Amino acid sequence: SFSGYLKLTDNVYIKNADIVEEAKKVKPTVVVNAANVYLKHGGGVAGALNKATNNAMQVESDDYIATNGPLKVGGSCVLSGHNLAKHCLHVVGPNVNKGEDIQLLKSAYENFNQHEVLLAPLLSAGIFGADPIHSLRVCVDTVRTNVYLAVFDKNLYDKLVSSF
Ligand SMILES: O=C(N[C@H](C(=O)O)c1ccc2c(c1)CCO2)c1ncnc2[nH]ccc12
């Protein structure tokens, strides 16, 4: 049900799209959220996905943290996808704006290998402060399962394709 994606490798595909609109159209088994360790979904991809769920993602996430404590940077958890997907895989990439180690970006993408197919953003890009060209290279060199990457910004999408 994914359509309009450019093939980068055997298993990695990319499109200039809003991940919320893509999730509402496709209703994938797994949508990846660019989470933080507290699952506080304020801005970027996380804020946008949570708003689309009418805040149900944040209510579920607060119950998960009250039971389990915070995630690790490079870690993940599987929660409901609400009206966007069967499941949401909340993955914590390092936030360079908060001083976190960029080497944890490969550990963050390894979480994707537990799922056959995923709709995802580029981890640690955008407001997390890492170079998106580096994030796409770590994705293609780490993930072995089928990943459909949605890049919201048109100008960044064009730069990622021409420099790949
Ligand atoms: O990475 C950028 N955008 C992506 C995207 O468009 O999907 C994006 C945006 C938000 C976000 C994530 C990724 C993951 C956490 O929230 C981006 N766009 C515009 N100017 C920029 N300068 C440096 C990077 C950058």
From Swiss-Prot:
Regulation: Inhibited in vitro by GRL-0617.
Reaction equations catalysed: Thiol-dependent hydrolysis of ester, thioester, amide, peptide and isopeptide bonds formed by the C-terminal Gly of ubiquitin (a 76-residue protein attached to proteins as an intracellular targeting signal)
Its job: Responsible for the cleavages located at the N-terminus of the replicase polyprotein. Participates together with nsp4 in the assembly of virally-induced cytoplasmic double-membrane vesicles necessary for viral replication. Antagonizes innate immune induction of type I interferon by blocking the phosphorylation, dimerization and subsequent nuclear translocation of host IRF3. Also prevents host NF-kappa-B signaling. In addition, PL-PRO possesses a deubiquitinating/deISGylating activity and processes both 'Lys-48'- and 'Lys-63'-linked polyubiquitin chains from cellular substrates.
Complex formation: May form homohexamers. Interacts with N protein.
Domain named Macro: residues: 1-164
Protein location: Host endoplasmic reticulum membrane
Name of encoding gene: rep
Membrane topology: Multi-pass membrane protein
Protein's recorded name: Papain-like protease nsp3
